């Protein structure tokens, strides 16, 4: 059971431009509150800053990255999100999109 989102890297702050049906149902947010925004709205108090940094650097360096983050639903309840971000480049080597597979690993 996984969800899938696409982030536009041609825009500076990598806003989300497509999310799967499961992503909305897992987090409780609608497309009116997800599209056009950065995925960081899912984070909160217990989210490890050290893990968030691993993603920030991989995006700035144009690499892939797999982290385990604590995220929060719209109702504020926490869940554990195994996140894997993958860069998508053009033939000139420039990153156009970042793609993400999110898995709820709360078991
Ligand atoms: C988020 N999923 C997600 C999916 C993709 C494709 C990308 C590129 C990032 C995420 N994030 C991270 C978020 O967008 C942001 O990059 C990070 O917060 C680190 O950058 P900053 O500048 O904020 O330090 C995801 N973050 C989540 O918490 N949950 C996901 O599903």
From Swiss-Prot:
PTM sites of type S-4a-FMN cysteine: 39
UniProt domain PAS: residue ranges: 1-62
Result, substituting residue 39 to A: No effect on blue light-induced kinase activity
The protein, known as: Phototropin
Post-translational modification: Autophosphorylated in response to blue light irradiation. 2 molecules of FMN bind covalently to cysteines after exposure to blue light and are reversed in the dark.
Locations listed in the record: Membrane
Superkingdom of this protein's organism: Eukaryota
Binding residues for FMN: 38-43, 56, 71, 81, 102
Family of the protein in this entry: Belongs to the protein kinase superfamily. AGC Ser/Thr protein kinase family.
Tissue: Expressed in gametes, pre-gametes and gametes generated by pre-gametes (at protein level).
Source organism: Chlamydomonas reinhardtii (Chlamydomonas smithii)
All residue ranges annotated as the PAC domain in the record: 63-107
Task performed by this protein: Protein kinase that acts as a blue light photoreceptor. Required for non-photochemical quenching (NPQ), a mechanism that converts and dissipates the harmful excess absorbed light energy into heat and protect the photosynthetic apparatus from photo-oxidative damage. Controls the energy-dependent chlorophyll fluorescence quenching (qE) activity of chlorophyll excited states by inducing the expression of the qE effector protein LHCSR3 in high light intensities.
